[model samples]
Target: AMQIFVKCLTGKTNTLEVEPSDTIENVKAKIQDKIGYPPDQQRLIFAGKQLEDGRTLSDYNIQKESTLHCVRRLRGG
Candidate 1:
């Protein structure tokens, strides 16, 4: 198991415990729990690359303690 940091444009940082082999979707679920952001609205970026739902973290070379930027849309309700 490993840890990754998710930061938003507002400078809020959330930490998630995950594995290197876990799918990006899996990480999103954890994000949802921590930040209340739905997967459909979460766009994860690591190492300057956008992470996809269907792919694994290692697929994007995401390692332990890597900082991922989360950009979302449509906050108006």
Candidate 2:
């Protein structure tokens, strides 16, 4: 099992206890549930790399104690 470290753009933080087998898409699903937004509006990050769609967390080399972020991408500069 692994824990996901997610920090929102509003400075809110959380740790989600989950299985490593969980896909990055699943994580976005949870994020949408937590933040009251559609999954399409969320952005994710890990190991200094922004997690993009069509990629799995395993692709990011995530492991125990890994730090990940779930953010909302802003349109303005």
Candidate 3:
């Protein structure tokens, strides 16, 4: 399992232990539980790349202790 951390713009952080095979969608679910942000509105980024629903952690070369950046979907026209 890989232990990762995610931080939001508000400086709130959540740590997650996940498998290399776990998809980004899976992590989003856990993030929702921890931070009360819905998956559809959550934007997770790592290494300057936005994580996709179909991509696994390993697909982005994520490893133990990786720290991801999170943001919320903005309301705009």
Candidate 4:
């Protein structure tokens, strides 16, 4: 299982255990569903790469046991 970390702009942090087979989109959805941010506005970082849409987790060398970090994007004026 992957120990994924979700951090919000407000300094809140939450960890979620997920399978490596899970896609970035799935993680994003989970963040919105659980982490309190809308998936469209959250950013996912894994394996030193910023995950993008239409890509599988395996594309970034992320395995079932790998951990992922999720963060909410900050907006600047």
The numbered model that scores best in TM-score is 3
Which candidate number has the best lDDT? 3
Q: Give the per-residue lDDT of model 4 (tens digit) for 1-77.
A: 76656554355556677775777788778766774564675557775677885576666776645555655443321
Q: Which parts of model 3 have CA positions greater than 4 angstroms off?
A: 73-77
In the range 1-77, model 2's lDDT, one tens digit per residue, is 77766665354565677676677778777766766543565567776676776776777777776767655532221
Runs with alpha carbons beyond 4 Å of true place in candidate 4: 63-77
RMSD of each: 3.4, 4.3, 4.7, 4.4
The TM-score values for the models, in the order shown, are 0.79, 0.69, 0.81, 0.62
**lDDT (Cα, tens digit) per residue for candidate 3, span 5-40:** 877536556688999899989888887776666466
Error of 4 at 58 (Å): 2.9
| lDDT of every model, 2 decimals | 0.75, 0.65, 0.77, 0.63
Residue 37 displacement in candidate 1 (angstroms): 1.2
**Candidate achieving higher lDDT, 2 or 4:** 2
Off by over 4 Å in 1: 9-11, 73-77
- Candidate 2, position 53, lDDT: 69
Instruction: Write the number of the candidate with greater TM-score, choosing between 1 and 4.
Output: 1
